[PDB]
Amino acid sequence: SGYTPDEKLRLQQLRELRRRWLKDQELSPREPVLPPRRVT
């Protein structure tokens, strides 16, 4: 049983792509750029 070599390689490539995407989901320190304006 186990992974075939093609399955292993495809899983590895998909894994590195997914980890890149997940890391890209993080917010930078300034990311919620909020525009301010007021009228016991």
Partner 1 sequence: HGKRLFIIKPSGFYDRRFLKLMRFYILLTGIPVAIGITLVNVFIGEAELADIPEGYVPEHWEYFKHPISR
Binding site for partner 1 (CB under 8 A): 25-27, 31
Nearer to partner 1, 9 or 17 (CB): 17
In the complex, least distance from residue 30 CB atom to partner 1, rounded to whole angstroms? 11
Question: What is the rounded distance in angstroms from the CA atom of residue 14 to the CA atom of residue 11?
Answer: 5
Nearer to partner 1, 6 or 26 (CB): 26
Q: Is residue 3 a contact partner of residue 11, using CB atoms and an 8 Å limit?
A: yes
Question: What is the rounded distance in angstroms from the CA atom of residue 8 to the CA atom of residue 6?
Answer: 5
In the complex, least distance from residue 3 CB atom to partner 1, rounded to whole angstroms? 30
